[PDB]
Amino acid sequence: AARIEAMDPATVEQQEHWFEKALRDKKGFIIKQMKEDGACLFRAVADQVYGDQDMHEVVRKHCMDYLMKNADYFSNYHGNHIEMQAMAEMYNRPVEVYQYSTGTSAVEPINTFHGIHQNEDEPIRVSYHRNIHYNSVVNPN
Known part of the structure; x- marks a missing residue:
């Protein structure tokens, strides 16, 4: 039951929410929800x-x-x-990927892809997430 409480959308939500708060507080960025x-x-x-x-x-x-x-x-x-x-x-x-982590400064891009040359253009920033999803487990036999 420890497994279960840990994988609960509750704890996952709290982490993702904390990550949102951090990004905003430390970098002023806002995660905007895209269609799934x-x-x-x-x-x-x-x-x-x-x-x-x-x-x-x-x-x-x-x-x-x-x-x-x-x-x-x-x-x-x-x-x-x-x-x-x-x-x-x-x-x-540049394309910057952000992701929740419990490591130091989760608010830094976990990786940055570079374009051809450096310029003053705002980087493209995206948010990596893994959303809970349930499928149906069928037994034909």
Whole structure:
């Protein structure tokens, strides 16, 4: 039952909520909720680039085009860090990923992907989360 209390959406929510409070308090950033579909970061990026998540298909399409035009290089390495690098280069802006952690200063990006050159453009910042979801476990037998 310790397992269960620990995985309760209650404790997970409290952590995610604390993480929101921290980001705001330490960096002044605000996590904005995107619509829930897939492991896709296209909605989050669209909000970062266009101020509108419903532009996700535009972002996805350019990303796919940019990957494909750069196949040989990207071939060396779904595969979200590949998408993230592509999008940093294509928008020429750094992409920063944030995530809850109990390590020191969770409020620092867990990783930063760089565009082509440095400039004064605001970085693209996204939030990595893993949301509780239940499926149905069927027994045909």
